[PDB]
Amino acid sequence: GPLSVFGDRSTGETIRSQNVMAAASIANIVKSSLGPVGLDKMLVDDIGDVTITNDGATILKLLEVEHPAAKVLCELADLQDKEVGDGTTSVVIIAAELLKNADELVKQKIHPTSVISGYRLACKEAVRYINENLIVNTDELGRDCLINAAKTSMSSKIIGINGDFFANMVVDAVLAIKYTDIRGQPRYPVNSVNILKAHGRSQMESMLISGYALNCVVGSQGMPKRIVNAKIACLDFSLQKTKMKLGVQVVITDPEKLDQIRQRESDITKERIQKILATGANVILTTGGIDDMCLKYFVEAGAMAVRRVLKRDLKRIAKASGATILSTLANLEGEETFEAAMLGQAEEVVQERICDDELILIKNTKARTSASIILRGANDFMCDEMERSLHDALCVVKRVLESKSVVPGGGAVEAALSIYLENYATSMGSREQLAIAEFARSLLVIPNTLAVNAAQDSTDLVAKLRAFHNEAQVNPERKNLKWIGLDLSNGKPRDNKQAGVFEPTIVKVKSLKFATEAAITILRIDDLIKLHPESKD
Amino acid sequence: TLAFDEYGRPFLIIKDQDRKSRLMGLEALKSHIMAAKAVANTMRTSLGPNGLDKMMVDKDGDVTVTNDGATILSMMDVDHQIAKLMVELSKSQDDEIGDGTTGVVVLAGALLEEAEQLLDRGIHPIRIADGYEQAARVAIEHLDKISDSVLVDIKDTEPLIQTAKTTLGSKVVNSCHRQMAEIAVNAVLTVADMERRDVDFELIKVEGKVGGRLEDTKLIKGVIVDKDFSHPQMPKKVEDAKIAILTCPFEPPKPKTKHKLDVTSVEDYKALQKYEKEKFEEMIQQIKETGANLAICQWGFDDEANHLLLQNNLPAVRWVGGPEIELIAIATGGRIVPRFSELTAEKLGFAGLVQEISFGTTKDKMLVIEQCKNSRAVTIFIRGGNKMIIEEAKRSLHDALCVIRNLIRDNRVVYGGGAAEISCALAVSQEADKCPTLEQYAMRAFADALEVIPMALSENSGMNPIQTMTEVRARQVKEMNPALGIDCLHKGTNDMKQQHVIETLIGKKQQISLATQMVRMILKIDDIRKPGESE
Amino acid sequence: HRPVLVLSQNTKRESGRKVQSGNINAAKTIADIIRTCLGPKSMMKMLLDPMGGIVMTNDGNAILREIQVQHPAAKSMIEISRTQDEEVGDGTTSVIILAGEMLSVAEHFLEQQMHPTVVISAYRKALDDMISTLKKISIPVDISDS
Amino acid sequence: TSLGPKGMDKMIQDGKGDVTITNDGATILKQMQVLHPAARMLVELSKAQDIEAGDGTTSVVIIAGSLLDSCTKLLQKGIHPTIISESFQKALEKGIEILTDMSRPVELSDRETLLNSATTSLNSKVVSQYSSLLSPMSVNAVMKVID
Amino acid sequence: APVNIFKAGADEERAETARLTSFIGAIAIGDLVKSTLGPKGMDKILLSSGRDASLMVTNDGATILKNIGVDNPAAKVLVDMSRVQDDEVGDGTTSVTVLAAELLREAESLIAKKIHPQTIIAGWREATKAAREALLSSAVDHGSDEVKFRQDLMNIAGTTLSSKLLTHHKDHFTKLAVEAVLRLKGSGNLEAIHIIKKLGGSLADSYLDEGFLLDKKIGVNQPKRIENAKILIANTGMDTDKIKIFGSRVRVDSTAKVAEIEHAEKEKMKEKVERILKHGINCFINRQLIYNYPEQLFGAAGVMAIEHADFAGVERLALVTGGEIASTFDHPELVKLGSCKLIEEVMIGEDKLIHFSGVALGEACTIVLRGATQQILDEAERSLHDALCVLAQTVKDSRTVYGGGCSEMLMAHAVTQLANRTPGKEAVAMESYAKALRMLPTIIADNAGYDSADLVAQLRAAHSEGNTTAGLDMREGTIGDMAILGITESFQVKRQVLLSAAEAAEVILRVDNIIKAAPRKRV
Ligand SMILES: Nc1ncnc2c1ncn2[C@@H]1O[C@H](COP(=O)(O)OP(=O)(O)O)[C@@H](O)[C@H]1O
Ligand SMILES: Nc1ncnc2c1ncn2[C@@H]1O[C@H](COP(=O)(O)OP(=O)(O)O)[C@@H](O)[C@H]1O
Ligand SMILES: Nc1ncnc2c1ncn2[C@@H]1O[C@H](COP(=O)(O)OP(=O)(O)O)[C@@H](O)[C@H]1O
Ligand SMILES: Nc1ncnc2c1ncn2[C@@H]1O[C@H](COP(=O)(O)OP(=O)(O)O)[C@@H](O)[C@H]1O
Ligand SMILES: Nc1ncnc2c1ncn2[C@@H]1O[C@H](COP(=O)(O)OP(=O)(O)O)[C@@H](O)[C@H]1O
Ligand SMILES: [Mg+2]
Ligand SMILES: [Mg+2]
Ligand SMILES: [Mg+2]
């Protein structure tokens, strides 16, 4: 008679109501961590680890989910870090409210393919309207655009101070790693900034190290820990005793030739260490291993040798100091040449005190003048929060300098799109106009969440918010009310042009493209079959 | 999600909702059809004169072989609420008419099978149910076209015997197909009130005793009770019985209240002996002064009163049931007397051969009343080879007693053997085109389901269903439609008027009416709220 | 045995006033443990180790490291005393009492329907004024004197 | 409910934990893992449609699910199943001659004819809103490698 | 109904295992009692698992099937069929069980031949009608010439007792069975022949008493034997009467009046016995118990007193002495007394029984069964009960047929003669009816160890051309004449074997669905 599957089958409006409650179970979590009045959470594990964070990606990655519609919204937050980097609480609330308003349409016996086709006409029109209603590029504002866009990202986190201490350190970090490319591409690789953590003084003592901050120790306590006018030798091979390979064995037939082979394992080893040290090299960085026999040659000659450094840290030092990453001997059948003209340069390599640990600093690197940020917090829970908040702040200034276009934040984009799409649904709307009209109400949840978390008036402040944006579209008298946002500290609509509340363009363009595409896949689960777990057979 | 909210709170609506079962879907209507078709496919093989019986085993281990559709569905342990409505459908046909209890379940399963293909085409289930009411109305009006009977209950019992042979032809009484059919005709006409057209089945006592054969079933005009002569030397044959029916035990009169009679002297104790000695001589003389020679008593006898019956030549039975003596006073024309002082010659019953008959080696000795005088109560004595053939004959002959009762309620007949179902299927197909606006597909599903009952007779008779039904249905359109059906041995031609296959009009009128309304209550349901396990 | 259709299985959810006023009581509980170990009239506190040893001390850092707590906000206060132990020497017991008292007065304003970002923005303005006060009342030290 | 441009997709979550959304009839029946032995032959029917045609997978189950459903009344009329198998072949051999009369001979050089054929198969999937890009890319990926 | 089963703990089957379980369960019943059919068949011993098992050996097919408790649903029809055969005629319960099982065994052969089961029912109804005319036309009546009817009655008892434990006792037990029914001289009540089983002695030591035996010996100080006595029986209360007035007390003022009441109670009990001895009797039988106060009154007057014989003990004494029950003693001129010659007490098996020797109008008998064990006495009682019930109906229906396989070949010949005048649809079912009738002499021939394949073939060749009295001779193992050897059975016994087996095989063959319900307290 029925289906003889050994799992479970649920059809109809059961799964159509379960996917909305699965998406609302995720959105109601992250609704309390949006905007400058948002608050952080606690993520306690079974082993006892506590993670205090408010970013939309760190919470949903550590949180376990079971529903298939819940894994779509959790993987939607992971894509926002790679594509944009701060846009990762706002996408989850929009994509869940896109399913909440579309559930009210399919309960009115409206076909979901008209809602899918109605959402594509509203998503492509939202990108078209936001690209024709921008204020200015990065020429008029200058450095004031980079600082004000950085403070908007920090307002939802622990580094949202009233001053410009953390804002100036981010702009000075991205501007110091300007790496040009072919065909006129000024790239800004923000992954080259080594963000370090140390439980020390307050947040106002966060050092901006112009150069690189290596997270390693010297090793042997007989080397000079401060070298002025240093020459960095970046190399990746273990400075240990000469061990033969698997194909080579030592089969001796004469007992007199025994001790000459035993001394040869250290003579070939020390032959490399004397030709890399006679060329003026004082700092040697190694990703392999330097044993206790080879540490004597640096104490005797007065050189610094750092062992077991990361491979991702050696590439950031050799590119910034002009050093060449050498793995072995080379240069056309040469015995030991080392190409001594390709040594790195540094002004000062100094191991400072980082509150009961050792940290090596390189000052200005003499070639590229890179930057590294050492964070200072109260405990380890604040340092993990300060690292995530700084990494999201580095991604904001990266997209502004690459794509010179900013949009007003604080719900100013979602207020203008809530009224333009209602007029867009009336012109060319015959049967898909109800999906475009619900696309505007789903976008209004971003200024609605700012009024809930601020404990302000909800149905009056957003009603006063769209009152200025309606007069900016139907009354062409140059009212300039396209930048009207929210003042959550006062509870009144303010102008985000003069207040300095700036967000990048692709933090909302890619947010509206990812949330609309995720809402289509969850809208097509009218039939769902769940099989039994095959564990013990 | 279920049992949890989006804010983390537990979401409990009803108690024990984890062990519940709820289906709305599109398979909730599909689960009702597949549960009802398996009941109709079971009862399809037990339809017609070639219908094979079914063996039913009770919970106590008792085995009863039944063929009627009322007792088959009633003795099941089906815990399915859709199939439980098919049990009450066959019970409602037995309580009202009592002949088509098998055919009303195959017809209801046929209407649901034709509605399954109509459900996949997008038709609403109430729209099919509203289309079946407009289609069953045509089958009622077309069934009243050819209907006539000439029963006068004097000498024209020939339409009454042939009507009962159609009901008894499908049972296991075909060896007594002419003998037992005449028993059920004369048993109704002697007890029915023709002035009110009312038949009382309390006057027709159906008793059974193992032994003999099926041909030894006789219609005893009178009563058959278990004779309990307290004296073993009582005469076992009374030629002319003046029956004295009484309801007082042969004892000194005991009151209904607490007495605690006091005895003080020895003159009061000697007065106790003379009080009871004259009381047993008074209760015996008051029967003999009325001229009675037979006594019936509901309660027990005393040992002192037993020998006084033999001295006065007065046979008497002991410990008769409640409604058993109620049948004696009607069969003999006497009156039931409460006391002994109210006995008279006018309250005596008249009977002829009053005797007890021993059956083989048993010690039952039932009463046989041969002669009577204008009795309004008869008793059928069913004999057989085992208790399986007797309890079925009690159920088979009860269906024969009901079809004679339906002829007194309505003297209009039809012709069975599938002849009325093919003729009614042509009436719905002719009115499906007048007009085919909305309910065209619902009326054609009704006419295709009315043809399941005659094609089930062709399947049980070893013929082909679609070959035989196409021949009979085409002959009713090329000429005026006769009583044209089928049979098992086929009796030569297929004319039901010549083969004397006669069924009642109101029997088939309630087969279409009850199956349509039961289909409407199982099509107009879109949810099931059954629980899970028992505990 | 059919599985229950749930989301985020075997985890807890808690928000509202029970977390804001719940982390204050966890901070007040640790500050009452080492409250009798600040002045010169303090007393030792004998502790018992899972290895079988005994730590009899009155220092605020060595007491909190021997306490295994289950509350998440109570685990934050133990890492505060570990930070004060590595930066300075005698900067342990004073921070745990002071952070419990700054959260004691912070619980009063959370009942007055005030947002927690207003109290923190007032705490950061107060923190910048406490550094400037200690630098005015300081005194230079002759390190050459014994 | 997964047939036509107005059809909806199905999501099958297996016992391992790899839940995928599928609309093609061959991919649905291979993930359902039906235990009934007569229903597993309908899974292999949609598999050979994916091999031979590639675009006949959901429709081969609607036909075979209805040809057996039409045999429900045929087996309740005393018709032998060998007689139904002879008559289904006579309806099959006459069915190809009806579809041949509806066919129109086309040429692969006409890009507008090949574009409208690929756009029809994309209307039932999730990429029906992306038929302005995927359907031109499906024709150009074929007509440059076939010679 | 198996597909998408809507039952809780109940199961069913339709046309696949329905006729399979019906044919397995019915043949295994007939193959069980197959070894007990015939004059050379063995017997069974029935035993339980424990808890007063009470082993009861029986050769009769009704007593075997009523105690086994078969769990098969279709096998209970053949169990109930043999129960009616024991209650109606008292013989042929084994013959009706094998015949009803051989019909369904031949019906199982028609499974693979694709014969419709309603055609087999219509073919067997015409076969049973042809078999009724074979027994009716071959029945031998006996009216006058009573010296041939008493010889015919000994052939009935000799045929019934030959298939039981009383094998080499036909010279004695035939006279004990014929003369017991011959002394009834009326209706076959089958309760005046009181069978008393006593241990000790062989079966040849058993005898038919000329008078009547009883228990509950004569009083304490009463005479044990009175010659030429007048027997008066009774069914009245003697002492502690509490006479029929519920709610009557003795409410006096002093204890001296209680002594006057209890003396007045004993005077009315003395006056009741004085009304009994006015008839002029010497023996007294009461169905109720006689206490000490009337027992002294009968002992002082020289009158016997038999207290609490039986409820049916006063009925047999009323038929063996020619009196009446006489529960009220107020008219001595309307009470008929019994007659006897000796009321001496005899000792049978160290138990003193009251022997009513020399009674007049003795329409009651007493069979004193003596055996080696209790198992032999329980078998010989049922063997005599299977012989007295046929002779009680042979005197009511004097028609007799020739048994020993001769009646079955006459019935099988009439079916085969009409099977050739029928079309081929029903002729195959009629040939299977005639083959099952020939199985009944085949079971008898093979139980002795004879060549059953040739003796039934010689019976079929004999009955095909004349020889209406030719049957199976189990003495020498050949074919002989049944009128010469004297092997006859009653007509009503052989009719009920044919008719009840044809009706019971009609019910089981018409079953296509066995829907058994969920039993109670079975897990
Ligand atoms: N000063 C401010 N005034 C008003 N709104 C603000 C201000 N600063 C930030 N916001 C709002 O707070 C929101 C924070 O979003 P966020 O959680 O950072 O997104 P994501 O999770 O993608 O990084 C932004 O959408 C922005 O509109
Ligand atoms: N001689 C016959 N020829 C053809 N059909 C017959 C004959 N006798 C009975 N039938 C058919 O057999 C059917 C038996 O129905 P039945 O099971 O008795 O209904 P119910 O269960 O209501 O009593 C009737 O509908 C009748 O048409
Ligand atoms: N003689 C004293 N008079 C007054 N106060 C004192 C005296 N000695 C110590 N104290 C106070 O006792 C406190 C002890 O702090 P302590 O617990 O040692 O801090 P930490 O835990 O950082 O080492 C100091 O803050 C100091 O002000
Ligand atoms: N634009 C359209 N208008 C109407 N029907 C369409 C359109 N596009 C596709 N269809 C229908 O949708 C159906 C999709 O069938 P499909 O599931 O692709 O079959 P298969 O599983 O064999 O590939 C086709 O039968 C076609 O008739
Ligand atoms: N002397 C004899 N010669 C031939 N056959 C005999 C003789 N005595 C008994 N039989 C056969 O043995 C069979 C015994 O049947 P039985 O078991 O008594 O049937 P049931 O159990 O119904 O009484 C009879 O059918 C009879 O034909
Ligand atoms: Mg009937
Ligand atoms: Mg397709
Ligand atoms: Mg016998």
Side-chain angles (χ1 to χ4, degrees), chain B residues 149-164:
Chain B
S149 63
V150 286
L151 49 104
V152 294
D153 314 3
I154 298 178
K155 59 175 180 56
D156 301 331
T157 56
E158 188 179 357
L160 300 174
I161 296 172
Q162 297 173 355
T163 311

Short mmCIF file of all heavy atoms in Angstrom, two decimals, chain B residues 149-164:
data_model
loop_
_atom_site.label_atom_id
_atom_site.label_comp_id
_atom_site.label_asym_id
_atom_site.label_seq_id
_atom_site.Cartn_x
_atom_site.Cartn_y
_atom_site.Cartn_z
N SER B 149 -46.70 -8.31 -7.16
CA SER B 149 -46.86 -9.58 -6.47
C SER B 149 -48.34 -9.85 -6.27
O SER B 149 -49.15 -8.92 -6.17
CB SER B 149 -46.12 -9.60 -5.12
OG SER B 149 -46.66 -8.63 -4.24
N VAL B 150 -48.69 -11.14 -6.20
CA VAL B 150 -50.09 -11.55 -6.12
C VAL B 150 -50.32 -12.38 -4.86
O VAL B 150 -51.17 -13.28 -4.85
CB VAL B 150 -50.50 -12.34 -7.38
CG1 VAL B 150 -50.67 -11.40 -8.56
CG2 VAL B 150 -49.47 -13.41 -7.70
N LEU B 151 -49.58 -12.08 -3.80
CA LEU B 151 -49.70 -12.84 -2.56
C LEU B 151 -51.00 -12.51 -1.85
O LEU B 151 -51.33 -11.34 -1.63
CB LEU B 151 -48.49 -12.57 -1.65
CG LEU B 151 -48.06 -11.13 -1.37
CD1 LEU B 151 -48.49 -10.70 0.02
CD2 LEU B 151 -46.56 -10.97 -1.54
N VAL B 152 -51.77 -13.55 -1.51
CA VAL B 152 -53.03 -13.41 -0.79
C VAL B 152 -53.06 -14.22 0.49
O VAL B 152 -54.06 -14.16 1.22
CB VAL B 152 -54.23 -13.78 -1.68
CG1 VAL B 152 -54.38 -12.80 -2.83
CG2 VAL B 152 -54.09 -15.21 -2.20
N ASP B 153 -52.01 -15.01 0.77
CA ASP B 153 -51.83 -15.81 1.99
C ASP B 153 -52.94 -16.84 2.19
O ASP B 153 -53.24 -17.23 3.33
CB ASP B 153 -51.70 -14.91 3.23
CG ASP B 153 -50.75 -13.75 3.02
OD1 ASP B 153 -50.24 -13.59 1.89
OD2 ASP B 153 -50.51 -12.99 3.98
N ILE B 154 -53.55 -17.30 1.11
CA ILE B 154 -54.60 -18.31 1.17
C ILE B 154 -54.18 -19.51 0.34
O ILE B 154 -54.03 -20.62 0.86
CB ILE B 154 -55.95 -17.75 0.69
CG1 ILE B 154 -56.42 -16.60 1.59
CG2 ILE B 154 -57.00 -18.86 0.66
CD1 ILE B 154 -57.72 -15.97 1.14
N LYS B 155 -53.98 -19.29 -0.96
CA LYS B 155 -53.53 -20.34 -1.86
C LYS B 155 -52.42 -19.90 -2.80
O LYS B 155 -51.78 -20.77 -3.41
CB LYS B 155 -54.71 -20.86 -2.70
CG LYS B 155 -55.38 -19.79 -3.54
CD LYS B 155 -56.45 -20.38 -4.45
CE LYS B 155 -57.12 -19.30 -5.28
NZ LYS B 155 -56.13 -18.53 -6.08
N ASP B 156 -52.17 -18.60 -2.94
CA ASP B 156 -51.13 -18.10 -3.84
C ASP B 156 -49.81 -17.90 -3.08
O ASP B 156 -49.25 -16.81 -3.02
CB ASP B 156 -51.58 -16.82 -4.52
CG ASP B 156 -52.86 -17.00 -5.32
OD1 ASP B 156 -53.09 -18.13 -5.81
OD2 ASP B 156 -53.62 -16.02 -5.47
N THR B 157 -49.33 -18.99 -2.50
CA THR B 157 -48.05 -19.00 -1.80
C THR B 157 -46.87 -19.25 -2.74
O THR B 157 -45.73 -19.26 -2.27
CB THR B 157 -48.06 -20.05 -0.69
OG1 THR B 157 -48.37 -21.34 -1.25
CG2 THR B 157 -49.09 -19.70 0.37
N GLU B 158 -47.13 -19.46 -4.03
CA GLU B 158 -46.09 -19.70 -5.03
C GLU B 158 -45.15 -18.51 -5.24
O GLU B 158 -43.95 -18.74 -5.41
CB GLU B 158 -46.74 -20.15 -6.35
CG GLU B 158 -45.76 -20.62 -7.41
CD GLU B 158 -46.45 -21.06 -8.68
OE1 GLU B 158 -47.70 -21.07 -8.71
OE2 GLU B 158 -45.74 -21.42 -9.65
N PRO B 159 -45.59 -17.23 -5.23
CA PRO B 159 -44.59 -16.15 -5.17
C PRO B 159 -43.88 -16.05 -3.83
O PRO B 159 -42.79 -15.48 -3.77
CB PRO B 159 -45.41 -14.89 -5.45
CG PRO B 159 -46.55 -15.36 -6.23
CD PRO B 159 -46.91 -16.66 -5.60
N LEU B 160 -44.46 -16.59 -2.75
CA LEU B 160 -43.81 -16.53 -1.45
C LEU B 160 -42.73 -17.59 -1.30
O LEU B 160 -41.73 -17.35 -0.61
CB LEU B 160 -44.85 -16.67 -0.33
CG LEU B 160 -45.95 -15.61 -0.30
CD1 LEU B 160 -46.99 -15.96 0.75
CD2 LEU B 160 -45.36 -14.24 -0.03
N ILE B 161 -42.92 -18.76 -1.91
CA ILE B 161 -41.91 -19.81 -1.84
C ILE B 161 -40.71 -19.47 -2.70
O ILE B 161 -39.55 -19.63 -2.28
CB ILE B 161 -42.54 -21.17 -2.23
CG1 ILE B 161 -43.63 -21.56 -1.24
CG2 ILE B 161 -41.48 -22.26 -2.30
CD1 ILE B 161 -44.42 -22.78 -1.65
N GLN B 162 -40.95 -18.95 -3.91
CA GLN B 162 -39.86 -18.59 -4.81
C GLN B 162 -39.08 -17.38 -4.34
O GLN B 162 -37.92 -17.21 -4.74
CB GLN B 162 -40.42 -18.34 -6.22
CG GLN B 162 -41.05 -19.56 -6.86
CD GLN B 162 -41.73 -19.24 -8.17
OE1 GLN B 162 -41.82 -18.08 -8.57
NE2 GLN B 162 -42.23 -20.27 -8.85
N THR B 163 -39.68 -16.52 -3.51
CA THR B 163 -38.93 -15.43 -2.91
C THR B 163 -37.98 -15.94 -1.83
O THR B 163 -36.84 -15.47 -1.72
CB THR B 163 -39.89 -14.38 -2.34
OG1 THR B 163 -40.89 -14.07 -3.31
CG2 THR B 163 -39.14 -13.11 -1.97
N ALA B 164 -38.43 -16.91 -1.04
CA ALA B 164 -37.59 -17.48 0.01
C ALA B 164 -36.52 -18.41 -0.54
O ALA B 164 -35.51 -18.65 0.14
CB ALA B 164 -38.45 -18.22 1.03
#
